[PDB]
Amino acid sequence: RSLTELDKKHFIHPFSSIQEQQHKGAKVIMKEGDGIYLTDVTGKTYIDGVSSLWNVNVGHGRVELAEAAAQQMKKMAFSSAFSTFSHEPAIRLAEKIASITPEGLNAVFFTSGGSESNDSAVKLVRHYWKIQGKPNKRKIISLKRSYHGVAAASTSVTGIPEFWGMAGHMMTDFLHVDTHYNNTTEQAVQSLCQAIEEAGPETIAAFFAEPVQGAGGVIIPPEDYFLRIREVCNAYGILFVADEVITGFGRTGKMFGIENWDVIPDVMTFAKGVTSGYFPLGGVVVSDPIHEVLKEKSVGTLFHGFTYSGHPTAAAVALKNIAIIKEERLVENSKRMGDALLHGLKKVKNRLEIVGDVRFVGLLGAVELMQNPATNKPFSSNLQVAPKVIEALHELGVICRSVTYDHTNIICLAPPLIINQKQVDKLVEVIYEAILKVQQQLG
Amino acid sequence: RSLTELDKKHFIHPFSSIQEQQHKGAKVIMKEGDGIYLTDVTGKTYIDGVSSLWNVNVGHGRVELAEAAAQQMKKMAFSSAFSTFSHEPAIRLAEKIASITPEGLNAVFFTSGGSESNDSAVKLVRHYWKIQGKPNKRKIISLKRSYHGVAAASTSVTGIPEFWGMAGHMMTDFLHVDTHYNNTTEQAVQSLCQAIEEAGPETIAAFFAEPVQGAGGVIIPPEDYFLRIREVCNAYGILFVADEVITGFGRTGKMFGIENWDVIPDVMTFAKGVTSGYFPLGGVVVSDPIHEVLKEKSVGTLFHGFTYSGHPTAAAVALKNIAIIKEERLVENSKRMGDALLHGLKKVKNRLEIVGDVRFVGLLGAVELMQNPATNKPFSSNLQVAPKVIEALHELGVICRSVTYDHTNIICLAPPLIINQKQVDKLVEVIYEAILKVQQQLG
Ligand SMILES: Cc1ncc(COP(=O)(O)O)c(C=O)c1O
Ligand SMILES: Cc1ncc(COP(=O)(O)O)c(C=O)c1O
Ligand SMILES: [Cl-]
Numbered sequence: 001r002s003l004t005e006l007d008k009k010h011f012i013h014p015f016s017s018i019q020e021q022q023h024k025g026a027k028v029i030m031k032e033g034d035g036i037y038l039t040d041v042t043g044k045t046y047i048d049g050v051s052s053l054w055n056v057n058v059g060h061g062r063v064e065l066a067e068a069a070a071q072q073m074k075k076m077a078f079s080s081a082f083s084t085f086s087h088e089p090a091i092r093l094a095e096k097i098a099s100i101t102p103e104g105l106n107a108v109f110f111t112s113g114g115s116e117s118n119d120s121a122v123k124l125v126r127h128y129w130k131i132q133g134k135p136n137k138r139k140i141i142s143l144k145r146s147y148h149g150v151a152a153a154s155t156s157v158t159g160i161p162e163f164w165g166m167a168g169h170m171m172t173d174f175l176h177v178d179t180h181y182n183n184t185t186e187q188a189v190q191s192l193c194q195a196i197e198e199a200g201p202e203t204i205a206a207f208f209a210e211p212v213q214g215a216g217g218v219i220i221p222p223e224d225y226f227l228r229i230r231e232v233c234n235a236y237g238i239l240f241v242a243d244e245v246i247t248g249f250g251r252t253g254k255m256f257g258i259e260n261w262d263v264i265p266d267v268m269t270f271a272k273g274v275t276s277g278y279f280p281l282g283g284v285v286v287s288d289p290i291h292e293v294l295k296e297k298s299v300g301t302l303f304h305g306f307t308y309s310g311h312p313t314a315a316a317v318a319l320k321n322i323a324i325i326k327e328e329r330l331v332e333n334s335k336r337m338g339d340a341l342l343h344g345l346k347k348v349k350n351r352l353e354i355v356g357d358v359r360f361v362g363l364l365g366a367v368e369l370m371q372n373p374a375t376n377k378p379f380s381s382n383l384q385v386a387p388k389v390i391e392a393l394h395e396l397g398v399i400c401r402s403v404t405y406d407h408t409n410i411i412c413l414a415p416p417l418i419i420n421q422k423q424v425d426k427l428v429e430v431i432y433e434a435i436l437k438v439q440q441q442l443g
Numbered sequence: 444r445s446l447t448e449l450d451k452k453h454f455i456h457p458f459s460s461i462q463e464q465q466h467k468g469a470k471v472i473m474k475e476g477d478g479i480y481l482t483d484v485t486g487k488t489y490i491d492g493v494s495s496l497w498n499v500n501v502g503h504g505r506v507e508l509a510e511a512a513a514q515q516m517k518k519m520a521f522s523s524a525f526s527t528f529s530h531e532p533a534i535r536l537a538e539k540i541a542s543i544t545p546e547g548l549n550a551v552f553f554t555s556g557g558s559e560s561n562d563s564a565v566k567l568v569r570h571y572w573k574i575q576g577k578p579n580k581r582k583i584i585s586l587k588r589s590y591h592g593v594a595a596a597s598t599s600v601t602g603i604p605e606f607w608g609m610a611g612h613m614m615t616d617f618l619h620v621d622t623h624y625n626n627t628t629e630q631a632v633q634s635l636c637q638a639i640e641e642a643g644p645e646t647i648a649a650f651f652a653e654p655v656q657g658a659g660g661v662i663i664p665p666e667d668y669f670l671r672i673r674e675v676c677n678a679y680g681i682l683f684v685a686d687e688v689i690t691g692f693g694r695t696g697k698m699f700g701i702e703n704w705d706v707i708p709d710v711m712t713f714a715k716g717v718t719s720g721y722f723p724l725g726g727v728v729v730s731d732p733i734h735e736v737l738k739e740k741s742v743g744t745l746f747h748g749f750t751y752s753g754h755p756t757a758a759a760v761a762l763k764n765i766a767i768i769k770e771e772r773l774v775e776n777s778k779r780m781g782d783a784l785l786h787g788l789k790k791v792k793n794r795l796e797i798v799g800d801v802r803f804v805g806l807l808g809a810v811e812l813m814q815n816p817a818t819n820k821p822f823s824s825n826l827q828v829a830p831k832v833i834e835a836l837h838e839l840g841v842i843c844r845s846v847t848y849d850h851t852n853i854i855c856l857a858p859p860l861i862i863n864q865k866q867v868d869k870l871v872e873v874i875y876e877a878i879l880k881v882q883q884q885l886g
């Protein structure tokens with residue numbers, strides 16, 4: 001009660017309705033986490049159905065991660081990486097990331113989050129073309145329904161228009177093309193080609209894509225989509241940036257999302273699950289040719305970086321986090337439990353009247369709600385079906401998040417990679433019960 | 444030796460010359476820190492003369508900060524603050540920050556760093572005017588020689604042109620006016636007025652200033668400067684944003700830098716010393732009227748925020764960090780040891796031939812080098828005097844940083860707030876010996 005009033009007075013939340021906060025107070029005040037579970041201050045326990053924010057990949061309560069952070073903080077919590085200063089944790093983490101990326105992605109620039117990483121990637125690809133002598137190759141192409149963060153550049157690279165309306169556009173040379181959502185590869189790829197030709201490939205620096213569009217509703221591309229993308233980018237001399245902020249570190253049943261489509265990007269950004277959210281960290285990995293151009297032509301000080309780039313404690317936590325993912329076979333577990341969740345939720349679809357698509361790639365998936373799945377009739381937006389299911393799930397002990405941009409009704413699912421079959425079974429049953437409740441309240 | 448080669452191959456550093464890295468390897472590889480000291484992998488020990496990056500304010504090796512992080516990471520390392528979800532650490536930290544800011548600055552938006560904070564502040568002031576019905580009040584005014592970070596907006600708000608040349612300008616509605624460096628208050632304030640009138644106050648959202656320009660060379664404004672600034676901002680209906688990223692949390696001998704000038708900003712950003720760099724954290728504090736406008740007119744979800752906004756572990760570390768600053772009287776110690784360092788370095792000035800200005804406000808200060816201090820003749824830039832002093836300091840066991848933008852030669856000084864008088868004495872003597880060595884090599 002005191003915590004609720006203090007929150008209202010003093011804490012302006014990210015991605016929260018301030019008017020809701022003032023009227024109702026915090027929806028929930030979390031206190032403790034353990035494995036896939038979170039407990040609030042009233043003692044009620046929940047399954048953390050999207051891993052908090054698609055990031056607590058190894059689960060809550062990891063004594064080993066706490067110990068790895070405490071050991072480095074006693075030893076040397078922070079040291080500068082500026083002016084070529086370095087330290088062993090960042091070096092070892094960079095070497096480790098290079099050992100687990102796609103072939104040729106061996107050089108890492110560190111940050112503290114996903115927005116920082118994507119803003120850095122925009123600046124790095126523009127820097128790359130400028131030192132190449134092509135200062136006109138400047139524009140960033142990205143997808144509708146994409147989400148790339150909300151620092152000033154990534155706010156406009158983000159393809160969901162709600163994010164532009166908070167402050168307006170601050171960036172300039174950005175272009176949004178059609179997504180593969182409910183589209184063929186040829187349609188999506190031709191939209192990219194048409195925009196490239198309207199703009200002229202000599203003005204374009206890079207194409208950014210999430211392997212699986214996360215905030216857009218877990219949009220999983222056709223099997224040939226990124227093969228084409230990679231061929232188009234090659235043909236026009238455009239850099240392909242893969243945004244692995246959600247899909248990285250085992251989330252889709254591969255170490256990185258893009259491996260599902262057998263394509264190597266020029267650049268990759270990451271954050272979130274690299275530390276299972278225990279410590280803010282992100283970064284940008286670049287290909288060998290790009291690193292070589294940097295070495296040859298990036299003269300003097302590289303005028304970009306963050307105080308906390310390469311933070312030794314972040315790096316110590318990330319190293320232990322990656323070792324856990326390897327030792328517990330969490331990449332493989334993510335693929336098998338994603339299959340198990342998809343199989344179960346398909347059965348649930350057949351028990352209900354209002355479930356449309358059910359899709360997963362590893363432990364990254366989604367359940368669409370529709371007035372008539374067989375004809376693909378959606379609910380009108382004013383019924384707010386997916387948010388109602390979120391609320392019913394919440395009351396039944398499951399935290400999920402919904403996506404309704406542009407008249408969709410999508411329940412997102414992405415539990416921690418440690419989840420087991422017993423737990424998948426209960427999660428599926430609760431999802432059934434919550435959709436059934438809303439299905440019933442709708443007459 | 445293996446660490447040096449791995450660093451070259453895999454780690455692209457912030458604000459480092461990649462070509463230097465490839466040719467010479469990391470200048471230093473740090474291993475351990477304790478209090479004001481750092482030790483590298485060869486066993487050589489250094490005084491951390493700028494607190495690593497103006498941020499390790501309570502010193503290295505704090506077992507209490509390690510323990511505070513480990514306790515929260517075992518309990519609940521991360522939980523979302525989106526959708527009005529909350530948790531006790533962020534609530535308590537927000538309440539704590541509100542207890543120590545200038546009067547009326549009671550509501551906090553959290554981030555993970557200084558660039559994130561300033562990009563958020565740009566977006567928040569633009570949001571504020573848009574919901575006020577003035578979508579044209581958009582432009583951000585800032586100072587030459589300022590540094591506000593290098594996310595996409597803060598890259599252009601930053602007033603030092605080197606930062607623009609890495610990727611070019613990405614932002615649009617920015618304006619740079621003359622700094623108070625070697626200037627009168629009336630000159631600096633009239634430059635601000637002239638630009639406001641050329642642009643028209645109806646197009647201007649905000650004026651950003653560091654209380655003390657840090658990366659610009661520790662530029663300390665005249666005593667009346669911010670009084671005038673605050674009157675000009677009031678007169679034109681412009682928001683005054685104080686960038687406390689360096690000057691916050693005791694650095695200048697006050698809790699916040701702006702208190703030295705008896706002025707309350709509309710908005711304040713912070714990072715760095717809030718956790719003494721033990722855990723990435725930053726934020727934006729807004730005045731009561733602004734919070735009230737948000738409450739009344741910021742409809743629906745606030746479409747801004749970072750995954751790690753309000754990170755529970757960051758907040759637990761920051762709380763203990765602030766309690767240390769209070770219990771060890773570090774704000775007062777910073778003022779007294781700044782006075783002691785200024786007094787000592789003035790004596791050193793009189794023993795040497797090439798020291799110009801010596802200035803401090805608390806433990807934030809600078810020592811200028813000049814060919815002829817009495818007539819104010821500078822060294823030509825091609826002599827690189829200040830960087831040579833940096834190197835000589837380094838070899839004598841002191842890490843400082845230099846500022847040479849626009850033909851200056853400035854040694855920056857900002858040791859952790861725990862430094863004691865014995866330590867100030869040794870630091871002063873080493874500074875004397877290093878400037879004397881370069882003074883001598885220059886014939
Ligand atoms: C795909 C993607 N990229 C970037 C971001 C931004 O990351 P952060 O919130 O750490 O700045 C997000 C956050 O959800 C994301 O989902
Ligand atoms: C005054 C000021 N503002 C902002 C920043 C950027 O902070 P960060 O490096 O955490 O993004 C800096 C960093 O030195 C700074 O000195
Ligand atoms: Cl392990």
Ligand SMILES: [Cl-]
Nearest residue numbers: 763766767770
């Ligand atoms: Cl204490």
